[PDB]
A and B are shown apart, each in its own frame.
Chain A
Amino acid sequence: EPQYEEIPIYL
């Protein structure tokens, strides 16, 4: 994913 990584990502 772009930008800083994020724990959440699914819908």
Chain B
Amino acid sequence: SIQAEEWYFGKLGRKDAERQLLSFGNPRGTFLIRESETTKGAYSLSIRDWDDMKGDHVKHYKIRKLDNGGYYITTRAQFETLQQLVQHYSERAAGLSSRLVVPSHK
């Protein structure tokens, strides 16, 4: 149980990630995570980015873990685990579209 359900849901795909995101009631900045069904079973970091000029939407950052290091949505910034990178991404965008699930969504 890395976090709980703010930036990570579990073993979800991009169809639900975009759904739950635009169907949960959370505001943009909701960087959800989930296992990628593209490979044997990698990870992912979906993100809700609705806008006041187009409607709601949801992008995604395929998460991958190198056995030579740890995790990384982009090869420019890896970490040791999903909780450790959600830790760095929380105080920093990490280089992607931005940080991860907002801490004070309220």
Contacts and interface: CB of A to CB of B under 8 A. Distances in A.
Interface of A: 3-8
B60 to A, nearest CB: 6
Interface residues of B, number: 14
A5 B60 CA distance: 7
Contacts of A7: 73-74, 76-77, 95-96
9 contacts: A3-B62, A4-B44, A4-B61, A4-B62, A5-B59, A5-B60, A7-B77, A7-B95, A8-B76
Contacts of B97: 5
A8 B75 CA distance: 8
Nearest to A4: B62
B12 to A, nearest CB: 14
A5 B61 contact: yes
